[PDB]
């Protein structure tokens, strides 16, 4: 043995680098996907609630119209987050 | 060994979080969808009976 | 440098996911709460008018 | 300069270990908290 000290100084950092990069990619790639899934899931939750709000609002509107109770609660309109899912501005096409 | 433990230590929970998130969204969606359908059914009944 | 980049590369998005998650839940909760309150208001009106 | 390569073989792996452990703890500790927050958030959504 014992001839190998100078290549060990080359080889050890290279393996560490490869293993570190792989670890980075293996953790990094799913973290980006999780974020996107989480966002999509919340976006969908918000949409579903919005649909629910519209349905519940429609039923009330019809009940009110049919019972003569002329004052639909102004609050159902407010539950509809009219917040526009911030459309992450499409990353400008990096013109290569 | 440390890099391997770190990889497993971060990798394993990241996968679990993804599965929990996915399962949790599906559950909320199902509930909301069921509620929406129920509300729609009552609407239909009110219109049909009045 | 690689360890630093890896740390920032995982650390930065992990923080963003936490903030997004927290914000997203708060938004859903607010909407549901607003809807619940609205539904409660209609109930009260129906009882008072009938 | 002198024999400074000999402790470099001791020192480099130790720093890497410390930095790796810190990186692990810094990523690992919030990942557990995120999971818990996500669960709590969903639980609360379900309750609402």
Author numbering:
A (entry chain B): 1349 to 1444
B (entry chain D), C (entry chain A): 953 to 1002
D (entry chain E): 1349 to 1396
Sentences reproduced from the published study:
The nap particle is an immunogenic surface adhesion complex from Mycoplasma genitalium. It is essential for motility and responsible for binding sialylated oligosaccharides on the surface of the host cell. Cryo-electron tomography (cryo-ET) of M. genitalium revealed the tetrameric organization of the nap particle complex, consisting of two P140-P110 heterodimers. The P140-P110 heterodimers form the ‘tight interface’, while the ‘loose interface’ is formed between the two heterodimers.
Here, we determined the structure of the complete native nap particle complex in-situ, including the previously uncharacterized intracellular region at 11 Å resolution using cryo-ET. In the cryo-ET reconstructions, the entire nap particle including the intracellular domain can be seen, displaying a highly electron dense and structured region (white arrow). The density of the previously unresolved intracellular region was solved at 11 Å resolution, thereby providing a model of the entire nap particle. The previously uncharacterized intracellular region appears compact proximal to the membrane and forms two distinct branches distal to the membrane. The previously uncharacterized residues 937–1053 of P110 and 1348–1444 of P140 were predicted with high confidence using Alphafold as a four-helix bundle splitting into two-helix branches. The Alphafold model could be fitted into the density of the intracellular region using rigid body docking. The transmembrane region forms a ~40-residue four-helix bundle proximal to the membrane and an unstructured flexible loop (predicted with low confidence and therefore not displayed) distal to the membrane of approximately 36 and 28 amino acids for P110 and P140, respectively. The intracellular density measures ~90 Å along the symmetry axis of the nap particle, being ~50 Å wide at the distal end, with 5 Å between the two branches. The density allows for the docking of all four intracellular helices, showing that residues from P110 are likely to form the distal branch of the intracellular density. The residues 1017–1053 of P110 and 1416–1444 of P140 were predicted with little confidence as an unstructured loop and are not displayed in this model.
